[PDB]
């Protein structure tokens, strides 16, 4: 399927290139998320007219805003006190709900889907590293030290 | 010697009554056929 790309696709993203893609890939991922628009002999003239450069800056500022946001908290440290068990066996596994809420209350205002946990769900008690992706090409590292209560 | 026919008004009406026929389309066709034949008694009427 010949489609025009808006966002930077890591593999074949080139700002509106007539590059074939699987129908399922565009149908289920690109179009619903706004990363591309189906163009068939009608929007090509339109893309090169108003999408050619007008939205290029609009897309870029989103990346610039994301880069600004992820540096809001220079400390980049998260401390949460949990009533862990006796010698391990933390009370209960916690994912993104509590940590995101605490960070939002005091720290960086970020959405739920932004937080990614590469080291499980924080089972063991101690120091852990969490990779935050505010953009495809922007990755952030945050150290979390859960302390037993 | 118990015989096949053991009368019961409630069972007769609820089985072959007018409203029983109208419930289904097959019963409605039964009434339609008997109207065409001109039968005086459309169904078993109490």
């Amino acid at each position: 399927m010949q489609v025009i790309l808006l966002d930077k696709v890591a593999n074949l993203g080139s700002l509106g290139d007539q590059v074939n893609v699987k129908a399922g890939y565009a149908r289920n991922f690109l179009v619903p998320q706004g990363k591309a628009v189906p163009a068939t002999k009608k929007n090509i003239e339109f893309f090169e007219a108003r999408r050619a450069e007008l939205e290029a800056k609009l897309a870029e500022v989103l990346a610039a805003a994301n880069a600004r946001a992820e540096k809001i908290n220079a400390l980049e440290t998260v401390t949460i006190a949990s009533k862990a068990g006796d010698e391990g066996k933390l009370f209960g596994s916690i994912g993104t709900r509590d940590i995101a809420d605490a960070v939002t209350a005091a720290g960086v205002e970020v959405a739920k889907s932004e937080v990614r946990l590469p080291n499980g769900v924080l089972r063991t008690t101690g120091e852990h590293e969490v990779s935050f992706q505010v953009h495809s090409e922007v990755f952030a590292k945050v150290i979390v030290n859960v302390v037993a209560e | 010697m118990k015989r096949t026919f053991q009368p019961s008004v409630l069972k007769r009406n609820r089985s072959h009554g007018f409203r029983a026929r109208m419930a289904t389309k097959n019963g409605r066709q039964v009434l339609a056929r008997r109207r065409a034949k001109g039968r005086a008694r459309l169904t078993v009427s109490k």
């Binding site: 399927m1 129908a23 149908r27 179009v31 619903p32 189906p38 068939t40 | -």
Partner: protein, 77 residues
């Protein structure tokens, strides 16, 4: 029923022939599936029971155009 909501494909009866040409009645069924299509005009997902051919039709045309035809058909989606 097994009716595509886009192309209108419905099961069609037919025969299946053996080596001895014996004929037995069969039925051909459309390749129907339940799919959710994202519509930007109304900003939500719409679930349609569409065939694989219909899904190709939706891709070739616009989802908005297909929805308009469905509305003109007079059947709720």
């Amino acid at each position: 029923s097994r009716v595509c909501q886009v192309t209108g494909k419905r099961p069609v009866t037919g025969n299946n022939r053996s080596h001895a040409l014996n004929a037995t009645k069969r039925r051909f069924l459309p390749n129907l599936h339940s799919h959710r299509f994202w519509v930007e005009s109304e900003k939500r997902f719409v679930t349609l029971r569409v065939s694989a051919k219909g899904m190709r039709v939706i891709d070739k045309k616009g989802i908005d155009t297909v929805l308009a035809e469905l509305r003109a058909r007079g059947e709720k989606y």
